[PDB]
Amino acid sequence: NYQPTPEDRFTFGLWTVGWQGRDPFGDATRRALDPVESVRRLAELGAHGVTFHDDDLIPFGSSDSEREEHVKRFRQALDDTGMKVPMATTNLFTHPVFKDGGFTANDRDVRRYALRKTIRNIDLAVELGAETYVAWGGREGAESGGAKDVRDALDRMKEAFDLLGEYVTSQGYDIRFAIEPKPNEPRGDILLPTVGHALAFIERLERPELYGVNPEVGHEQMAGLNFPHGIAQALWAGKLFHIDLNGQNGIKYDQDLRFGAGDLRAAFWLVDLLESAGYSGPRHFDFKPPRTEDFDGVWASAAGCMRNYLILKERAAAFRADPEVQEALRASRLDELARPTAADGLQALLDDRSAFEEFDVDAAAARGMAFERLDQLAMDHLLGARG
Amino acid sequence: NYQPTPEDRFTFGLWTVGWQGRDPFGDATRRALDPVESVRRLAELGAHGVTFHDDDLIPFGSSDSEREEHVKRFRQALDDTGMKVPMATTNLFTHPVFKDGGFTANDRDVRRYALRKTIRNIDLAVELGAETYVAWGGREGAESGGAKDVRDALDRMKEAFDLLGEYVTSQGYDIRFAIEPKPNEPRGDILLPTVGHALAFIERLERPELYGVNPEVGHEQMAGLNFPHGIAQALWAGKLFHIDLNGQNGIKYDQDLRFGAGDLRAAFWLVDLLESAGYSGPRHFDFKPPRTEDFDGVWASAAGCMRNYLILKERAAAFRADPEVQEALRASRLDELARPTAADGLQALLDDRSAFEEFDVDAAAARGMAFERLDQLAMDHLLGARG
Amino acid sequence: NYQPTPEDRFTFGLWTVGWQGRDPFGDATRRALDPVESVRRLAELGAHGVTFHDDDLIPFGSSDSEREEHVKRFRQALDDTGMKVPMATTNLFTHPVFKDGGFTANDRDVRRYALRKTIRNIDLAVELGAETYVAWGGREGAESGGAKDVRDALDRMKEAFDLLGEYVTSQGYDIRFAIEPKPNEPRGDILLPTVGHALAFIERLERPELYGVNPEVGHEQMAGLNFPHGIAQALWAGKLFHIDLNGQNGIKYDQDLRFGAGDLRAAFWLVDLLESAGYSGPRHFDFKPPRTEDFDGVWASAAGCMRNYLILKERAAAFRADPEVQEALRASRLDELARPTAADGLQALLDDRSAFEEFDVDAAAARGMAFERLDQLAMDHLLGARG
Amino acid sequence: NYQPTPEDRFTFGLWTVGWQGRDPFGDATRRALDPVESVRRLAELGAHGVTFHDDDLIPFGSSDSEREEHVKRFRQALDDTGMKVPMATTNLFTHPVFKDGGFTANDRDVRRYALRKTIRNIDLAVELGAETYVAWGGREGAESGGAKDVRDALDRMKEAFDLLGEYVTSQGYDIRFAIEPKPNEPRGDILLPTVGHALAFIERLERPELYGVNPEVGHEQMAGLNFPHGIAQALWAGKLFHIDLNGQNGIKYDQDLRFGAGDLRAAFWLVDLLESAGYSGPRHFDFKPPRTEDFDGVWASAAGCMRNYLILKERAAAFRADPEVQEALRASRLDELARPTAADGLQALLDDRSAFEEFDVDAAAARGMAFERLDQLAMDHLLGARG
Ligand SMILES: [Mn+2]
Ligand SMILES: [Mn+2]
Ligand SMILES: [Mn+2]
Ligand SMILES: [Mn+2]
Ligand SMILES: [Mn+2]
Ligand SMILES: [Mn+2]
Ligand SMILES: [Mn+2]
Ligand SMILES: [Mn+2]
């Protein structure tokens, strides 16, 4: 029916299913998971792969013999299951040293440490076969206006990303970078708060081709933005390197609900866009099984992420393929949207009386867009209420 | 005391003081103002200049003899007062023809009309001496996911802006363009919803040097974003061509309160940044005197915009000049933020044991940032409560 | 299939389908509708009835002969169609006299006028057979802190509602009042901003039994609140006299989308609650067909409101009736939630060692709530993806 | 200058200054404080007293000899300093047993445990001299619609509060209860989400006189509501038993900034209201020193809470006392707001032609409210920019 397979490219962070349930106001409700157990259980659910922060895989401050052993055991689990590691990242947010940032910490020694910690993990990510290296600058920002000169912080952020690009080029690595925006939490305001801000920043890097975005559903929704619209701009720019899928109920703390939860209609339009555009990267879930759940509930929530993607994929494809919907799209002039405004050129447009002097503004204004009929056909398809 | 002068570069839209008070749920509470009266009253308050949409200055559908007369009378008022016109824009949002957009309307004939209407007004803006031409795509967007293919809409938006750049180049005009973001209202979601999205879009235009942003305080705040942070990114990019100043009380409808109202502390940090950065453009107010007000209240609200800017300018300068604040900034390592992370280069950083192998993470983590003391000195300066 | 009938008790405001499309930033896109035409077209769609503000039915400032004729024509249309008028209200928000409020205007003469205008329309509402009289205090509030002493305003609000209760009692009318909350828009902040605030206020009235709430989906969502939770509190209090159904995409301007649009999952849980609780009042839609639409689109959007309610009613009933869902509800201890905490009484609870001294906190904490499995069964039912 | 004294009634929670800095995404940045040290340091800053959750004072699962010793040491610190304990509360949110709630947990045994844990701490609160017992139901609510029947949960909430009222009456205690609303966090949606919802709920309790509200600045602001307006409604109801003071930058995670930070103008209008109304209870701060700070920064942030209250108290008093402001208040008809609408009675109002038949609507509408002038005088007073 809606059964996931490795072909569907579903991936999960170790820190997702492995979340112990500690929140601002509460203690852990679940024991820590061995990464080996997570890889095995996710493979059984039909996942394609898993992702990690450095410190998820190797406990912070492990010796060289400890690090080697943690990686060896994980690699054996991947080999035993056929699971992949398409993406990795660095934890630049948990340890108290990062309380004012990693790459943009006011303290220079912390900025240098953050870069060395990242570089060590890039080497490991390449060893495990990752194609994308995510950076979430969760500690980059401020609670107050004087704490952070944002122009200086952006200079430091550019310097850091430029050094990382120099490093990967020097080593001949194929890996590319993906910046993950978030507007706030845990800092009062975070730098590069949206997909737009991250895309703009990339254009100022020395080697912009090496960098894209890793947008997260709930993050754009924490700014009340339209996630499908932001994804469309990322695709338009050629910068959708990776994506984080989850749910969020509007403007509040980062909930990280399972995908499909939260804004259901936005999830529908997102899947419609990813499929229409031919996005070929991982369908990665960055979610937290609520702390109300036991281990059985963790795996049920993970399974639900994949199931909801596959239901929505079916419904979006049926919408686009329906002759009645195709007629409604023409009635709404989606065909005309895709035609050039002035392929004839500037001079021809200026000399066209039909575009101004002799344009019947009133007749054009009277023409309905027929968007409500189109949207109710979309609702009917999502809900399986066609006919 | 806090008396404005033309030197301070304060400007106002005709549509601001001239707002009749019609809202979604109410009729006009004030008669229309003649633009000549607005120019005269604003000059008396110490303004530098005024801005206009085409249809604010010339009623929509005026004949050639009518248009000429409206412009002649306005030019005489400017000449009588010494007032300038630094910026103009096009109304692509009021007339029902624009119900689905101007530049990104699904209907091709409407897109062509929108461009011709804009070009006619660029000529007038140049005649009146404007240096910046704003575009607010208030109707560009959607209420529903199927109504608007956002990739196609961005193609049409780029085509429009590229044609406008070709036009100004062909005529030898000195004018430059400024895109004004807004996240929503009047469309459910608007394209290019934030400063970041607009900056990213500009990088894809044929002649990016001709285009910048016109960010508005209340617009970024309607997405819960930090306006000073967004302005810093615009400055970092070299794209702060113009700005709209006002107030907003968080995430709701676009209030357009007088500047200083709304988020007072954010207004303080904004003025601090504009002054520190040496922003040289107009200090333009895009505000609505509340519909509770009579004409005396309109002018009081306009005067308050300028007064609040000047109070905050004084307090921000006193903050930065205070020796105790300068000491606190060093205690918080703002000096170290401005120093390069690795001027020594990538190889040197990799070979530096002090940056990783021999870095004392615990001692670094124990060092307080001293941001609370710094922020309370900022509060004390804003409130005039020092000593 | 999902065909509405008068039995389903669907009602619409004249101002909904009759909305001309004027928004803060745009002119009307549709001609005014005759109320007679609206009654006829809604009856053809399967509606039960219609509602009105005074000034929707009788243009403001009509003479006695004009008023009589407008009512006569409307009554004939109701008689011709079998349509009902279950609710009416007063427009205390459009006319510029109400710029600072009706019942809570600072000007005493305006407060008295607002009461007389309301009383005149109560008489008409009773003549047309209305059971509920709504009050939306859209102008009651402020943009600034000094403009409105809120304790004094609440005194005036109570005085107004008490006089209206005295009036209906004096005339022997059966009609009851319903207060409609909204947090903001068109005032910066509106008094009685949520269902909770309105319920609390009612408890201070002289005759609280005469007053309930008319909560609106989009209004509670403009404060980021859970609409189903608020409806549950209203039901718990015995105060759900009427309801307004529509859609809203999070925290922004009041969108008034068709019901089902906006937060789809919240619409599902709402219908589930109304049906489970046996709510017997009108299913009233307070929505705006987007201004993109022509008259055909207006009727399509109205039809979609009713269709979406009926789809969701089917899916919620199937969820509750499913044996697998009933098992999941027991697994999640919804049965135990409905049992008294201490029917044995305070003394027995104090003397129960099993409740404290001998309670195994660790074993209780280890028990998963199984909420994720339950919620995925709810998702599967909503989407028609069961098996 | 702005030096606090015990007379000013400033209080702090042990969990405020004692916050170790653990957030959703980060480890502790500060060691735990001994409550004895906190009492001593706060007394030195000019505080009046301190408040506690049970588990802040006595580590969870302490023996009878341990509990006795922790209380003895704390009582000695209070005696050594002259500090008071005006309020206490129960931690019904940290321990994993409370993952689905205390009073409204689906599991009946957990509800009974929550009541016994609360009752034990009420006895201790009375021993330490507390006048108010706060309940924050942070775990009462849901992430999903099926998890929690809200009518049943409200039945259980009422049963719990009724038992607590029976208990305090049986023991002859003078203590009263204060319910603390919050809209969300840590649950997706929390029951009793606003001041209004809590006030409404209290009216359904068996002994409503024993219960009031403990509203928190940042909590109402997390729903985008006007905190001063909500406080005014609480005062109007006679239910402002206690208050939590802090700051919040709009609609996001609960920031708990020092008081004065966040929405500065709202803080001004709040202090103005508390002082005007003669609120006599504790001025309690529920704030978190940001985790960027060391122990010196903790005490600086605490001191800043009190300093900002005292600055704003001075500015609000100067505003109200200014003859020019008194004139502006009359110009804006605040005097008329405080006069009864119809002291003459319903019949007299109906028979008054001046209130309807002969009311000049146009002349009334033309009268400006003069609110902008009034608000700019308020701004000038707050900023110390008068003349
Ligand atoms: Mn997240
Ligand atoms: Mn993520
Ligand atoms: Mn605006
Ligand atoms: Mn603007
Ligand atoms: Mn509405
Ligand atoms: Mn309504
Ligand atoms: Mn809090
Ligand atoms: Mn609190």
Side-chain angles (χ1 to χ4, degrees), chain B residues 67-135:
Chain B
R67 191 189 184 77
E68 191 280 309
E69 188 56 46
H70 287 289
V71 161
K72 181 191 268 293
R73 287 176 40 72
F74 182 68
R75 202 173 208 146
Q76 190 63 58
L78 299 169
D79 291 350
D80 289 343
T81 57
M83 289 273 280
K84 304 305 177 174
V85 181
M87 180 277 276
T89 66
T90 221
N91 188 322
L92 299 177
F93 52 85
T94 294
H95 195 283
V97 74
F98 300 124
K99 63 188 182 305
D100 188 45
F103 299 160
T104 78
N106 287 354
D107 293 301
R108 174 171 177 275
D109 60 353
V110 174
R111 301 192 299 268
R112 293 174 70 77
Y113 173 72
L115 281 161
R116 292 289 303 280
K117 188 179 194 285
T118 299
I119 289 165
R120 187 184 209 202
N121 204 54
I122 294 166
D123 290 339
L124 178 57
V126 169
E127 286 146 32
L128 293 166
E131 29 237 324
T132 305
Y133 200 86
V134 164

Side-chain angles (χ1 to χ4, degrees), chain C residues 179-348:
Chain C
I179 299 172
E180 179 166 351
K182 191 181 188 183
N184 70 73
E185 198 207 32
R187 306 305 306 269
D189 290 291
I190 295 172
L191 275 358
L192 306 187
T194 81
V195 168
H197 299 76
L199 291 171
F201 172 83
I202 286 165
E203 294 301 327
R204 306 269 289 116
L205 300 175
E206 286 312 301
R207 287 179 198 82
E209 72 278 3
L210 296 180
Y211 311 81
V213 290
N214 186 44
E216 179 180 311
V217 174
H219 294 176
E220 307 298 295
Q221 287 170 0
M222 286 170 74
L225 299 179
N226 182 313
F227 189 69
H229 287 194
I231 295 307
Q233 188 162 359
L235 287 162
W236 184 69
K239 301 287 187 189
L240 192 67
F241 286 8
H242 199 269
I243 198 169
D244 282 359
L245 304 170
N246 68 10
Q248 179 67 22
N249 289 291
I251 304 172
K252 53 183 76 162
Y253 74 97
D254 185 350
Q255 299 192 283
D256 291 348
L257 304 170
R258 82 186 181 295
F259 183 67
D263 190 340
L264 179 54
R265 289 247 281 169
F268 170 82
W269 293 115
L270 173 65
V271 175
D272 176 73
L273 174 58
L274 295 176
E275 300 300 319
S276 293
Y279 169 67
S280 62
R283 278 66 174 172
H284 172 84
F285 301 104
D286 181 10
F287 88 110
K288 286 175 169 26
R291 50 176 245 144
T292 56
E293 303 309 290
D294 66 15
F295 286 120
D296 304 311
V298 163
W299 310 114
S301 194
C305 284
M306 295 183 282
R307 183 181 183 74
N308 291 332
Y309 191 100
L310 291 177
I311 300 164
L312 293 174
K313 172 173 180 271
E314 172 197 71
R315 306 304 167 81
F319 172 75
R320 293 291 176 184
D322 180 350
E324 186 172 337
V325 171
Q326 300 173 346
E327 179 56 62
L329 287 162
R330 294 185 291 272
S332 294
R333 285 89 81 204
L334 276 297
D335 59 329
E336 295 206 23
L337 182 75
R339 294 189 272 267
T341 296
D344 51 338
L346 175 66
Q347 191 57 242

Side-chain angles (χ1 to χ4, degrees), chain A residues 15 136 180-182 185 216 218-219 222 244 246 248 254-256 286-288, chain D residues 25:
Chain A
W15 67 92
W136 175 58
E180 180 167 350
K182 191 181 187 183
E185 198 206 278
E216 179 180 311
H219 294 176
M222 285 170 74
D244 282 359
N246 67 10
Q248 179 67 21
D254 184 40
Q255 299 192 282
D256 290 350
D286 181 10
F287 88 110
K288 286 175 169 27
Chain D
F25 299 102

Side-chain angles (χ1 to χ4, degrees), chain A residues 258 308 315 375-376 383, chain C residues 258 308 315 375-376 383:
Chain A
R258 82 186 181 295
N308 291 332
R315 306 304 167 81
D375 193 54
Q376 189 60 42
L383 296 179
Chain C
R258 82 186 181 295
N308 291 332
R315 306 304 167 81
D375 192 54
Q376 189 61 42
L383 296 179

Side-chain angles (χ1 to χ4, degrees), chain A residues 56-294:
Chain A
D56 296 329
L57 177 57
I58 301 130
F60 180 120
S62 297
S63 61
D64 300 75
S65 60
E66 281 167 48
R67 191 189 184 77
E68 191 280 309
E69 188 56 46
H70 287 289
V71 160
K72 181 191 267 293
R73 287 176 40 71
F74 182 68
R75 202 173 208 146
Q76 189 63 58
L78 299 169
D79 291 350
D80 290 343
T81 57
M83 290 271 281
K84 304 305 177 174
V85 181
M87 180 277 276
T89 66
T90 220
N91 188 322
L92 299 177
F93 52 85
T94 294
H95 195 283
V97 74
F98 300 124
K99 63 188 182 305
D100 188 45
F103 298 160
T104 78
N106 287 354
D107 292 301
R108 174 171 177 275
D109 59 355
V110 174
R111 301 192 299 268
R112 293 174 70 77
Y113 173 72
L115 281 161
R116 292 289 303 280
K117 188 179 194 285
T118 299
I119 289 165
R120 187 184 211 202
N121 204 54
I122 294 166
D123 290 338
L124 178 57
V126 169
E127 286 146 32
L128 293 166
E131 29 236 324
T132 305
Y133 201 86
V134 165
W136 175 58
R139 294 284 171 199
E140 320 308 317
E143 288 70 63
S144 53
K148 196 65 52 172
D149 188 309
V150 171
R151 289 173 301 145
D152 289 329
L154 289 166
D155 286 340
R156 299 295 79 74
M157 196 108 82
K158 164 172 167 58
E159 182 171 23
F161 281 108
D162 287 337
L163 283 159
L164 298 177
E166 186 170 346
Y167 180 70
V168 298
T169 306
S170 78
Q171 297 305 291
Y173 292 159
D174 299 289
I175 203 165
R176 299 182 295 171
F177 294 102
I179 299 173
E180 180 167 350
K182 191 181 187 183
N184 70 73
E185 198 206 278
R187 306 305 306 269
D189 291 290
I190 295 172
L191 274 358
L192 305 187
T194 81
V195 168
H197 299 76
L199 291 171
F201 172 83
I202 286 165
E203 294 301 328
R204 306 269 289 116
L205 300 176
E206 286 312 301
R207 287 179 197 82
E209 72 278 3
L210 296 179
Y211 312 81
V213 290
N214 186 44
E216 179 180 311
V217 174
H219 294 176
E220 307 298 295
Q221 287 170 1
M222 285 170 74
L225 299 179
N226 182 313
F227 189 68
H229 287 194
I231 294 307
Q233 187 162 358
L235 287 163
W236 184 69
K239 301 287 187 189
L240 192 67
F241 287 7
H242 199 269
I243 198 169
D244 282 359
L245 304 170
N246 67 10
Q248 179 67 21
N249 289 291
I251 305 172
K252 54 184 78 166
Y253 74 97
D254 184 40
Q255 299 192 282
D256 290 350
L257 304 170
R258 82 186 181 295
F259 183 67
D263 190 340
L264 179 55
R265 289 247 281 170
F268 171 83
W269 293 115
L270 172 66
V271 175
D272 175 73
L273 174 59
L274 294 176
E275 300 300 319
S276 293
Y279 169 67
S280 63
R283 278 66 174 173
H284 172 83
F285 301 104
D286 181 10
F287 88 110
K288 286 175 169 27
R291 66 189 289 279
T292 56
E293 303 308 290
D294 66 15

Side-chain angles (χ1 to χ4, degrees), chain D residues 6-11 48 86-87 131-132 176 213-214 235 240-245 274-275 277-284 309:
Chain D
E7 286 75 66
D8 306 306
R9 203 165 256 275
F10 295 125
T11 64
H48 172 83
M87 180 277 275
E131 29 236 324
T132 306
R176 300 183 292 175
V213 290
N214 186 44
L235 287 162
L240 192 67
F241 287 7
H242 199 269
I243 198 169
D244 282 359
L245 304 170
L274 295 176
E275 300 300 319
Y279 169 67
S280 62
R283 278 66 174 172
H284 172 84
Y309 191 100

Side-chain angles (χ1 to χ4, degrees), chain D residues 215-232:
Chain D
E216 179 180 311
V217 174
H219 294 176
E220 307 298 295
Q221 287 170 0
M222 286 170 74
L225 299 179
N226 182 313
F227 189 68
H229 286 194
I231 295 307

